[PDB]
Every structure is written in C-alpha cells, then in structure tokens.
Amino acid sequence: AVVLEANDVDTFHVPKAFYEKHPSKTHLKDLDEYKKLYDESIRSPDTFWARMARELLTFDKDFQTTHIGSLENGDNAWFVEGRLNASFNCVDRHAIKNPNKVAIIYEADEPNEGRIITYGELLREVSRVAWVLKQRGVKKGDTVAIYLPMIPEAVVAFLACARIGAIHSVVFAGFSSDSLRDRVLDAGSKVVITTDEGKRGGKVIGTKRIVDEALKQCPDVTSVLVYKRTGAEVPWTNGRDIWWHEEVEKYPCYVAPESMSSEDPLFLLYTSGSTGKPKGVMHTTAGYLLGAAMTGKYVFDIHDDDRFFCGGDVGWITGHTYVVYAPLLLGCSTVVFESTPAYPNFSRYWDVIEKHKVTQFYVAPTALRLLKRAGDEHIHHKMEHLRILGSVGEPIAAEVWKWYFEKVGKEEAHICDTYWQTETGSHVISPLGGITSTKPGSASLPFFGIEPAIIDPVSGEEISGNDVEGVLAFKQPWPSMARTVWGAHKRYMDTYLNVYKGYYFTGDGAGRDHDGYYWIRGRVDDVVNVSGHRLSTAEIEAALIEHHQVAEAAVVGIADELTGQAVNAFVSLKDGNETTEQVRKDLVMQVRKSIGPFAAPKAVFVVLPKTKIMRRILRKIL
Ligand SMILES: CCCOP(=O)(O)OC[C@H]1O[C@@H](n2cnc3c(N)ncnc32)[C@H](O)[C@@H]1O
C-alpha cells in the first residue's frame, strides 16, 4: 500500500446519460480498444503514428520515415520527409469543405460585445495579416513576438506567422516591460504584434505603453503591428508602429501558404525553468500538430459540429494547444474568452456555455474553487450540451470534483483530469472522454505513445509493477515532444534528458496505484505554479536580491486555495534610511518590475536557515 493517496478512493464510471445525450458515437468503441491501440502505440509506434498522421493531417508532400533519433542523444525527428503548413490544416482545408462553418466564437470582456467568425472569414483575415508581415520584412524562419490578449486577433496572429513560415513567440499579456524585452532579445524577433490597450474584467491593460517601454532596449525591432482594441490615445512611434485596421485593407484576402518541413520550428513558448533565465521551448510543425489533433479527438472527444471552450490564455501552452490548434485542426468552433470567470458576475463561465451551446469546457481547479465558494445561486443554467469537462494544472480535489460533476456537468458529463506540460505539447497522462473511468485526484492512464516509468530518485532505477512511488519519466519519445530550448540545447539536454539517461524527466513526483492509475505529486525542482503561471523560485529570489537593502533572499511555494500555490519570500535586510514597511512594499513592486504583477509574493518576512538553505524548514513553519 505504498500509494497512500489512492487508499479507499474508488473508480468513477462514465455517466449513463453521457451516452444517451450523445450526438453520435465516441471514437473508440470500448476500453479494450484503448488498450489495443495503446499497446500498438508503444510496441510498434512507427506503424502506429504513421497511420495517425495521415488520418488527422494533410501534407503538401507525403512522408516515408516515421521517426529517427532517441532520448539518449536528443535528436528526435518525426515524419522527416513530409511537408505541410499549419495554417492550411487549421483554416484552408476546412474553408474548402464549407467556408461558412463557424471557426471562432468570440466572447468579449463585456457581455454581448463579441462576434462569430467563420472559416472563410478566418482565412481572409489570416491571409491579410500574412501579407502585412511579408511586406514588413518577415521571412521564413524569423521570430515574431505576440503580445496580445484573448481577442480573436490573437488566433489570427498565430496562423499568420505559421502561414508564411515564421516562428511566433507568444508573450502572455500582462508581463512587465522587462519580461517582454528579454523574450524579444533571446528570440531575435524584429516584429511584434500587440494592442493599444487591453480589457480584462473591466480593468485596462496598457499593452502598447508596456511595449514602448520594452522596445527602448530592443533596437532591432523595426515593426510593431498595433490592433485598435479600445481606441484610447496611446504613444505612437512613427515608421515603426503601424495600425492593424489600416495595413490590413491594403493587401489581398488570400496568400499562398508556405510549404514547411515536418521538423520546421512552428513556435517558441518561453517557460520559466528551475534555474537561470526563462527559456524558450520550441515545437516543430508535424509532431506538435499531431499531438493537438490526437488529444482533441480522443481525450476531449471532439467532433465536427462541437463547440470547444478552453479557459486558458494564449500566453500559456493551454491556450496554444487547446484554444487555437487542437480545435481548429479538427474543424470545430473554439471559444475565445476575453473576460474573467467573475466578470460581471460569477455565472459568466456558464453564461457563455449556455448561450453558445458549448460541448466541452476546459478550466483550472483554481478557478473552480473560487466560483464554488461564491454560491450555487450562480449555476442554475441547464447547459444541455456540456459533454466533457476538463481540468488542468493541478490534481482536482475530491470535494471540487463533486462540485464540478453536479453543478456544472449535471451528473451527465465526463470529467477529465489532464496531466501535461509545455514541453509535452499535448496531453500525456489523461482519461479518454467517454471511455476511461476516473479517480478524484488521479490522471488515469497514459496517452498513446506515452510509456511512463516510475524512477527511484536516489537509485536512478526504474521501479516496476503497481503500488510504487517515485518520480515520473517517459521511456520513449512521442511526436508532440519539445525538440529543443532555443539558443541552449545543452540546457535542454541537462534539464530533460541527462537526469536519467534514456528517459524524459517530467520534473514531477508521481505514484502508480494497484489499478495502474497515476497520481501526480507536484514538482520536484524549485518550480511553482501561481494562478496558472509557472514561476521559478530562484528567479524571484534574484529579483529580491537586486534591491540595494536585500542581502540574501529565499522563496518557497506552499499550497493555496486561491491561486494553487503561494510564493512566500524570506529576505535579509541591511540597515537603511526607510522602514521595513516601505521596503516590504518596495520589495513586492521590484518583483513586479522584473517578472510581472502575478509574480508578486503573497507575503515577505524580514528575517535564514542554512547548513545550503533548507527550503523545507521554511515551508513547514508556514
Ligand atoms: C499544462 C499546464 C501548464 O503547463 P506548464 O508547463 O506551465 O506546467 C506544467 C506542470 O503543471 C503541473 N500539472 C499540470 N497538469 C497537472 C495535472 N493534471 N495534475 C497535476 N499536476 C499538473 C505539473 O507540475 C506539470 O509539470
């Protein structure tokens, strides 16, 4: 009984109403077909992933070799001779079948201020922005920084970069000017797409003013594409800044999509790591797109006429994979939500679902716990078409699971706790919608092409059998796996492939129970997740140490109901001219200037245990 977190927890089947209220049948017949297809995906993956790639993707030129490389050397290449384009698979091929089919369902910050975009309209707007970038010097292989909020213009900026072969480096709207500047210089981006101002939950985000303050140290940026979101008077540097609505009307509504290799870099997504500077994880085209289409088809049970809603932001891989690519690849409607879960009221999430007849909802448990405390007077909507409920970022608690199952799902929808990371590109351990039975707090079985292993951290040896515990690792590579860390492959190898040779190291502790289910126990390294943002404790410590009156700094993350994790900072202060309260206030703002407002610590305590600072003694006292 080594796995104590699985003691007495029971299996939860798919509700009988799921099958009764289903428009069609699910993609897999039963649980055995999963096992049959899963064992095929790990025994002979070369034949498996080849059949899947041609069913879900349409290539310019066919491929011959499914996979070469290994995890030992970090030289993985998938579908090496194939050629394709991301914009074609997301827009063009669906617009060819029927251009009047809905692609994007835009729900603006204020209710009843959105719009509905068809695949034909999406192809035109993507083609126009593609032309604007081409006429601004964007060539194949260049990087473009996307500093946009959750407006439909963000999805257009994604595929416009992919249509011409550019590499889009999306920066979460709300990072400080210093964070944006660093992500621009590291990727060498010469073009940046942004808005004049942002509108989230009634508050205004001065995006354009942040970009201006960031570009003061980014000289190589020569083009800024600004979209008029609020129309407020914003600083304008002429010759460099250009208005979206002005430049868009100059160029044709169609452009030919650049043929890309399977292993051409598709995008960069900068992810905070265990140490040093935030590193830009890279994903190629064919493998990543196949990962998104596969998980959408089998985890979320996405069909043609479905309406998909993911609460994640585009600044995160959740919005990358499941707001943009996975739904559009499969040809359904994706909901682009610009507001907060509690604006103007706590029923907003469900207001959108009922209005747009959403079939699949994807939320973080941190947002569920906040709405659960508010009261059940807000969730009185029928939400008749809600079929798959998804959680991400943390294991869903048994009490939160029941609320998600009864109030939202009406005891008729399948809850899927999906475990994955930015470097996985898509779900790796998750239940299959309408197939896999679940356990509250467990991520259920692994996905196709995911061979998980429990590793003894001290011994570095794999622990076989069930009812085992250790750290989580993958034995063989999968198509969606990240290919490198931009500008630092050595850092990529040491972080993910040199910890346990022949394995991919997730950086999480895990356990496997008697039934074979997996239980994610959280990060092993110095990494925390606050409000959906992945932060490094070492990075926050460096910002605090920069203060002239901070001798040393120590930051540790503990559990928190409001934001998943809470960053608590221990600081040592020399004598100074201003009091501790002023320094305490000045220490929080200093972190906001380096990283952002969300990186602000919950509390700072002027105090230092050492032998090497013991993080455990600092956490346990809290
Ligand atoms: C994909 C969400 C955002 O991705 P990021 O790369 O920012 O963070 C991934 C990490 O979030 C946790 N995590 C994510 N999903 C779960 C999950 N379902 N259960 C437990 N922990 C989870 C795991 O520690 C993981 O290494």
- Hey, whose CA ends up nearest to atom 4 of ligand 1? 421
Atom in ligand 1 nearest the alpha carbon of residue 534: 7
- Please tell me the distance from the alpha carbon of residue 457 to that of residue 470, in angstroms, as a whole number: 7
For the chain, how long is the longest CA-to-CA vector? Answer: 72
- Determine how β-strand 360-363 pairs with β-strand 307-310: parallel
48 lines ligand 1 (CB under 6 A): no
- Reading phi first (left if > 0) and then psi (alpha if -120 to 50, else beta), residue 9 is in beta
Residues pairing with 248 in the sheet:
none
Breaks (C-N over 2.5 A) in the chain follow: 607, 611
How far away, in angstroms, is 519 Cα from ligand 1 center? 12
CB neighbour class for 348 (10 Å; exposed up to 12, middle 13-18, buried from 19): buried
520 lines ligand 1 (CB under 6 A): yes
- Reading phi first (left if > 0) and then psi (alpha if -120 to 50, else beta), residue 239 is in left
Q: Which residue has the tokens 């410590």?
A: 541
Q: Residue 463 has which token pair? A: 């622990």
CB neighbour class for 51 (10 Å; exposed up to 12, middle 13-18, buried from 19): exposed
Kind plus residue range of the DSSP H or E element containing 473: strand 468-474
320 lines ligand 1 (CB under 6 A): no
- Please tell me the distance from the alpha carbon of residue 79 to that of residue 399, in angstroms, as a whole number: 44
DSSP label at residue 11:
-
Atom in ligand 1 nearest the alpha carbon of residue 417: 18
Contacts of 384 (CB under 8 A, 6+ apart): 21, 357
313 lines ligand 1 (CB under 6 A): no
How far away, in angstroms, is 360 Cα from ligand 1 center? 20
- Hey, whose CA ends up nearest to atom 11 of ligand 1? 393
Of the candidates 363, 481, 464, the one whose C-alpha atom is nearest the C-alpha of residue 422 is: 481
CA distances from 60 to 36, 111, 122, 178, 265 (A): 31, 41, 21, 40, 17
- Hey, whose CA ends up nearest to atom 5 of ligand 1? 421
393 lines ligand 1 (CB under 6 A): yes
Of the candidates 396, 424, 384, 204, the one whose C-alpha atom is nearest the C-alpha of residue 294 is: 424
- For the CA atoms of 257, 262, 266, 268, the dihedral, rounded to the nearest 10 degrees, stands at -170
How far away, in angstroms, is 453 Cα from ligand 1 center? 17
3-state helix, strand, coil in the chain (%, to 5): 30, 25, 45
- Please tell me the distance from the alpha carbon of residue 366 to that of residue 371, in angstroms, as a whole number: 9
CA distances from 80 to 12, 86, 517 (A): 41, 16, 34
- Please tell me the distance from the alpha carbon of residue 104 to that of residue 324, in angstroms, as a whole number: 9
421 lines ligand 1 (CB under 6 A): yes
- Hey, whose CA ends up nearest to atom 8 of ligand 1? 421
Atom in ligand 1 nearest the alpha carbon of residue 522: 24
Q: Which DSSP string corresponds to 417-443?
A: E-B--GGG-S-SB-PPTTT--B-TT--
DSSP label at residue 6:
G
Q: Please state, as a whole number, how many other Cβ atoms lie within 10 Å of the Cβ of residue 385.
A: 17
CB neighbour class for 239 (10 Å; exposed up to 12, middle 13-18, buried from 19): exposed
Which amino acid is present at 322? Y
Of the candidates 385, 286, 379, the one whose C-alpha atom is nearest the C-alpha of residue 21 is: 385
- Please tell me the distance from the alpha carbon of residue 575 to that of residue 550, in angstroms, as a whole number: 10
How far away, in angstroms, is 522 Cα from ligand 1 center? 8
- Please tell me the distance from the alpha carbon of residue 234 to that of residue 369, in angstroms, as a whole number: 37
- Determine how β-strand 102-107 pairs with β-strand 115-118: antiparallel
DSSP label at residue 99:
T
